Design an enzyme around this catalytic site. Structure first.
Site, PDB file in Angstrom:
ATOM      1  N   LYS A 108     -36.970  37.359  -2.798  1.00  0.00           N
ATOM      2  CA  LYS A 108     -35.782  36.602  -2.450  1.00  0.00           C
ATOM      3  C   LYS A 108     -36.029  35.103  -2.455  1.00  0.00           C
ATOM      4  O   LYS A 108     -35.236  34.346  -3.012  1.00  0.00           O
ATOM      5  CB  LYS A 108     -35.221  37.082  -1.110  1.00  0.00           C
TER       6      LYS A 108
ATOM      7  N   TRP B  11     -32.985  49.262   8.231  1.00  0.00           N
ATOM      8  CA  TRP B  11     -32.981  49.036   6.795  1.00  0.00           C
ATOM      9  C   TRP B  11     -33.393  50.368   6.209  1.00  0.00           C
ATOM     10  O   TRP B  11     -34.516  50.810   6.414  1.00  0.00           O
ATOM     11  CB  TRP B  11     -34.008  47.968   6.457  1.00  0.00           C
TER      12      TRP B  11
ATOM     13  N   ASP C 263     -42.319  42.817   8.868  1.00  0.00           N
ATOM     14  CA  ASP C 263     -41.712  42.870   7.540  1.00  0.00           C
ATOM     15  C   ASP C 263     -41.121  41.487   7.315  1.00  0.00           C
ATOM     16  O   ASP C 263     -40.234  41.084   8.053  1.00  0.00           O
ATOM     17  CB  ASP C 263     -40.613  43.940   7.537  1.00  0.00           C
TER      18      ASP C 263
END
EC number: 2.6.1.1
Lengths: 400, 397
Positions: free
Chosen positions: A250, A134, A215
């Site tokens: 999210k 990422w 994460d």
């Protein structure tokens, strides 16, 4: 005459993402499809405010009496709710007071705070991240002066988490290094360790002495809130020390409010309290206290039985929709005559997977069919609908 | 263990004094050590304009999807208008770029990281007395912090001679940080003429001014408070402004501020700003929307802007009135020295002029709490507590 302070600065490179968004906006084809998006979209193509969030915001508007500063770690109830999601209500970890949580501006802010805390207070020099990565991880950790290395993870041609390669590559990780894992819904591949694999990784980290950083930005998007935390909890059960960078962007649809958390875990409460005092120092040197609104929204929802139930159903609906779309994508590719197997899509969790398309194929898809993926071939399944599935699958079959 | 050997950070003296104040059982206790605005009732309310803006946003908002690294465009435009003036040549020439940031604190860290990574700046000069958080922010980015002379404590004056002499050591390439108005903690600000002299000096010596601008509207008014900043901007070099809306919108916990870069021209500031965005991407990525949306909603709406400007005026005028009352009451209670300097100072904060021992005595003996440095927040004063407070002060002189 003096040279200007900014005179020698060379422009940063143009962001390819924004550029591709440009071409997409200008595309006059009515059937164009954007699979390159990085957020959830619903069946109507919108990224709405969750109803539970609107209800919480109404409550806050009516009830908040001051916006005076909170502490560097933000809202206490938000911290408690965060630890319950991470470790489970009644968790021995929480009972032993082994964890401290700072509310932060997004999961991104939590990663930065972790990086600064590590660089200033520990001997950590290196953070290991997955391949594919990422992209923002490298920038964040490098900014704190930490080297970033990649470990083997995804076998793209075989659409498989290559666990043997992962384990082998990590032999190079030394005691005192940090190894970062995505807790669930790996971004961008959607390929996650099984529980057995997580347990193996947890045991390995103890044996080798590296510090796990988890994460955790998609809790609830994979299999469920508890299920998605099983990997994290396997580390927590085996390790004296851990860092978790959480995001609510999210799973509460609170992207722009910047709501996340950095949680430290240590062997005991005395140790975690000492460490956390220095994490607070890292925060004070940065943005000081975190932004209240989004955290207040999260705490308001999680602490209220009725609102929490509404929110959980909304998240369940999102998770189930993504699961249904993954199955539909595979079925439709078969029906439109794809020359090969896409079964891996059903085995993957969350919004993102690698389609397996090459750069040339992605380009052709955009030019010839108006279907937009990113160069890597990543697609966001939430950008698919029953409305656009057959057209997008016909386009994919055509470029194979 | 990775954390086993970590040394505990020192106790935060602010939290420690707040603990003491909280436990103090004396009903006559007075808290002048506060760092935020408080109204006549001892509260820090949400401004009426902000409550209304929040209602508009709740009605109107359709998504919380990410914005860019620089945040809400209208917020940046409103910010530049406040800083430089609507219709200003600077804005017309597109010489400035603004990133919304998490508070003025975040703006300062973004500026620091941007400077450290992209320029030859090695050193930042701040005033004595300093605002404690500056050092931690700039040091965190690898930048040395040095102090320049500023306040003459005995005479309660900005020692401009010392200031200028101090800055002769500031080198081309260094940054010099100035509070744009309402210096914290002294309330002692340069006059316009002094700001102009400082601006000329910056051009002569080639150092980069950074203006910390957290109290616009608390001194003399919005435009007046920006005059110093605008004197630097008139030099047509480079400038950085770290803005906060925490105090003038009462939005403390929403973390609303901005970092604005200014250069001689648009092309130059564009190149610089692209790298500022990179510094933001390596930190918290995009900024928190709620507070910035509130500010933009208020500043771009005639009805709400009028409500907000009246509220801020009421706060400014209350502080000015209390400064006068404080001085008058000290004299009436028989203070053995002149406190007229209090009337010549701007904003919530002044140094009382009390020594550390006196501050200690004031708290121990009379339950009046100032900061160890002798800083007081005038907004903690009221007509009802003024006489007892002043009697206590006279008593320790």
């Amino acid at each position: 005459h003096h040279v200007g302070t900014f005179e020698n600065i060379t422009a940063a490179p143009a962001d390819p993402i924004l550029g591709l968004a440009d071409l997409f906006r200008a595309d006059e084809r009515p059937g164009k499809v954007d699979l390159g998006i990085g957020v959830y979209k619903d069946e109507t193509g919108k990224t709405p405010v969750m109803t539970s969030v609107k209800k919480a915001e109404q409550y806050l508007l009516e009830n908040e009496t001051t916006k005076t500063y909170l502490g560097l770690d933000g809202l206490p109830e938000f911290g408690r709710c965060t630890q319950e999601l991470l470790f489970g209500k009644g968790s021995a970890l929480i009972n032993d007071k082994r964890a401290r949580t700072a509310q932060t501006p997004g999961g991104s802010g939590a990663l930065r705070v972790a990086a600064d805390f590590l660089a200033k207070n520990t001997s950590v020099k290196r953070v290991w991240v997955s391949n594919p990565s990422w992209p923002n991880h490298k920038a964040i950790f490098n900014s704190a002066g930490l080297e970033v290395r990649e470990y083997a993870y995804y076998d793209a041609e075989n659409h498989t988490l290559d666990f043997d390669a992962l384990i082998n590559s990590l032999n190079e990780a030394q005691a005192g290094d940090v190894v970062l894992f995505h807790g669930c819904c790996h971004n961008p591949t959607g390929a996650d360790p099984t529980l057995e694999q997580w347990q193996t990784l947890a045991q390995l980290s103890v044996e080798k002495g590296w510090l796990p950083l988890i994460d955790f930005a998609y809790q609830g998007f994979g299999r469920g809130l508890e299920e998605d935390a099983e990997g994290l909890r396997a580390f927590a059960a085996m390790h004296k020390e851990l860092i978790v960078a959480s995001s609510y962007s999210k799973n509460f649809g609170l992207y722009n409010e910047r709501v996340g958390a950095c949680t430290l875990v240590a062997a005991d409460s005395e140790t975690v309290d000492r460490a956390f005092s220095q994490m607070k120092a890292a925060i004070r040197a940065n943005y000081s206290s975190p932004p209240a609104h989004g955290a207040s929204v999260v705490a308001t929802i999680l602490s209220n039985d009725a609102l929490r139930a509404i929110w959980e159903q909304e998240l369940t609906d999102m998770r189930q929709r993504i699961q249904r779309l993954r199955q539909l994508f595979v079925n439709t590719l078969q029906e439109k005559g794809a020359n090969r197997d896409f079964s891996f899509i059903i085995k993957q969790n969350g919004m993102f997977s690698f389609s397996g398309l090459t750069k040339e194929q992605v380009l052709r898809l955009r030019e010839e069919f108006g279907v937009y993926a990113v160069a890597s071939g990543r697609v966001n399944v939430a950008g698919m609908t029953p409305d656009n599935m057959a057209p997008l699958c016909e386009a994919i079959v055509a470029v194979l």
